[PDB]
Amino acid sequence: NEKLAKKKIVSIDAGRKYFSPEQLKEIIDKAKHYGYTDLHLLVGNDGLRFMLDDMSITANGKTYASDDVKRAIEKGTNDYYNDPNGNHLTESQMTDLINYAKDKGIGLIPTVNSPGHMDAILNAMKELGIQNPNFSYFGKKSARTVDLDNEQAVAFTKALIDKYAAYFAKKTEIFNIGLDEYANDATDAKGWSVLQADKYYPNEGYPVKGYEKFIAYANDLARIVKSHGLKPMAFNDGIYYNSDTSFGSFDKDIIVSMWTGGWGGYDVASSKLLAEKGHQILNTNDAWYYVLGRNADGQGWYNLDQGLNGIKNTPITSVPKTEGADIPIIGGMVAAWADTPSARYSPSRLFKLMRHFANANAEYFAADYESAEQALNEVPKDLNRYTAESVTAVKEAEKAIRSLDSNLSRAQQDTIDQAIAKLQETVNNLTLTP
Ligand SMILES: [Mg+2]
Ligand SMILES: [Mg+2]
């Protein structure tokens, strides 16, 4: 019961790279088939590839017109990557996609990333006329990250998030605000250290109250998301970075997507600390990451063979940086990324990754009843013309399938499959009364 009740999630980076409604429906079909519960769809992640029908934004003592915001976001996303396959999903397409997923028992969790990984939103703000939205580090400007000292940029960004969250209200349950990898380009992946630095190394030109403002920012987004009845989620790396609780406290209602245990000189809070602070944790271990186009050993970090190895060697219960503690989880999430969005999207490669994650953790993933349902639909409805003995065998086989536990895992798939085979055999053995 506890294993099957977990969320099993596939994450798709449709922020950097365009994915069509058809492509996403196919992913949903596979997710359902392999026993997943949710699709985690990034739509704002460097690029921004989801447009509401009304994109008007009220901030900074004015309203930015819907059509101007749309044109700014379309231009801004293209400036990040002009994808020949498409620019954005429309509101009609999103609503249809969520409905399609819901009818299959699949939830959809969107991401609209900030204050990092927001190249397109920063570009859009510049197109609207907002001045100097980008964070800079000793003259090196981040293409991805907003300056938290810029009230006009921050106000616009929050109102944009609010607008998206208002749309997702009722139709989803979780909204990922991201919060990962602050100014990773401009600081050479040391952004959290940079934001915290002025407190400990004053008068050296580090951002004054940098990390303190980030906490306030994260918390305000959490408040905004919660106002819409949605649970806010965020990636772990900036949450109590360096295990430092002295700058302030994060909203406990933020679910933590735990993707990294950190690296040399990038010292993240342990999952133990985060649990102890009151956060629920979604295991998003980057052991399972796949970057499109990096399709085999040697082709770079998060290549497909690496991800498949991570899936074989790091179970769904193994959370980054536990300090040896027992870390409870709300579920697990395997993630595919489009760091190089011009890479060709290969469905079979993604589905292999998804299939392996489900098979490696089979007790956690729901069994497939699709074919059992179909087999029942294919039984002849009227059996009167057949012998009593052959009829009895069919009715017994039918009962046996309807008697199956409706909460079996992938680990018990063969139980379902044998029941299907037995029904098919009994139907084949139906004998006309002589
Ligand atoms: Mg590219
Ligand atoms: Mg492609």
Same domain, 236 and 373: no
* Ligand 1 centroid – CA 130 distance (Å): 27
- Its domain, for residue 420, covers 366-434
Name the β-bridge partners of 111: 42, 176
CB atoms within 10 A of CB 330: 18
360 shares a domain with 250: yes
CA of 345 to the centre of ligand 2 (A): 4
Domain end call among 365, 394, 418: 365
Choose one of 340, 365, 390: the last residue of a domain: 365
Total domains present in the chain: 2
User: Are 226 and 199 part of one and the same domain?
Assistant: yes
How remote is the CA of residue 103 from the centroid of ligand 2, in Å?
Answer: 27
Q: Tokens representing 92?
A: 């009609």
Q: How far apart are CA 33 and CA 292, in angstroms?
A: 22
| 290 and 187 within one domain | yes
In terms of Cβ atoms closer than 10 Å to its own Cβ (0-12, 13-18, 19+), residue 104 is middle
Nearest ligand to residue 81 Cα:
1
Please name the residue ranges forming H helices in 201-303: 210-227, 271-276
* Ligand located closest to 340 CA: 1
Closest CA to 336 of 12, 6, 49, 32: 12
Nearest to 245, CA basis, from 277, 210, 216, 281? 277
Kindly state whether residues 271 and 396 are assigned to the same domain: no
Rounded to 5°, angle at Cα 386 from 381 and 389: 110
Residue 292 to residue 182: CA distance in whole angstroms: 23
Q: Are residues 336 and 372 in the same domain?
A: no
Ligand 2 centroid to residue 343 C-alpha, Å: 6
Q: How far is CA 130 from CA 50, 61, 91, 179, 372, in A?
A: 21, 12, 26, 22, 58
Q: Are 358 and 410 in contact (CB under 8 A)?
A: yes
Same domain, 202 and 328: yes
Amino acid of residue 318: S
Query: CB count, 10 Å around CB of 265?
Result: 8
Q: How far is the CA of 355 from the centre of ligand 2 (A)?
A: 21
Check whether residue 289 and residue 387 sit in a common domain. no
Q: Give yes or no: residues 177 and 28 share one domain.
A: yes
Distance from the alpha carbon of residue 430 to the mean position of ligand 1, in angstroms: 60
> Could you say which ligand is closest to the alpha carbon of residue 46?
1
Burial category of 161 from C-beta neighbours within 10 Å (exposed 0-12, middle 13-18, buried 19 and up): buried
Answer for the pair 247, 199: CB distance below 8 angstroms, yes or no: yes
User: Mapping DSSP to helix (H, G, I), strand (E, B) and coil, where does residue 45 land?
Assistant: strand
CATH number at residue 318: 3.20.20.80
Helix (H, G, I), strand (E, B), or coil: what is residue 157? helix
- Phi, psi dihedral angles at 147 (to 5 degrees): -80, 115
- The dihedral built from the CA positions of residue 338, 362, 367 and 232, taken in this order, carries a sign that is negative
φ, ψ for residue 45, nearest 5 deg: -165, 95
- Any idea how long the chain is? 434
Query: Which residues touch 34 (CB under 8 Å, ≥6 apart)?
Result: 354, 355, 358, 365, 368, 410
Please indicate, yes or no, whether residues 325 and 413 belong to a single structural domain of this protein: no
Residues 144, 219, single domain; the answer is yes
- CB–CB of 13/302 below 8 Å? no
**Helices 388-402 and 413-428, axial angle in degrees (round to 10):** 160
By three-state DSSP, how is residue 109 classified? strand
Which residue among 365, 384, 411 closes a domain?
Answer: 365
DSSP string, 25-47: HHHHHHHHHHT--EEEEEEEESE
Q: Side chain identity at 202, as an amino acid letter?
A: P
110 DSSP β-pair partners: 41
Q: How was this structure determined?
A: X-ray
Name the residue among 418, 423, 409, 347 with its Cα closest to residue 379.
423
- At 182, list the tokens: 């602050």
Residue 152's φ and ψ, nearest 5 degrees, are -70, -40
Domain CATH for 433 = 1.20.1270.90
- CA of residue 340 to ligand 1 center, whole Å: 4
| Side chain identity, residue 299 | Q
Q: Distances from the Cα of 273 to the Cαs of 8, 259, 277, 321, 324, in angstroms? A: 24, 15, 6, 10, 12
Same domain, 266 and 382: no
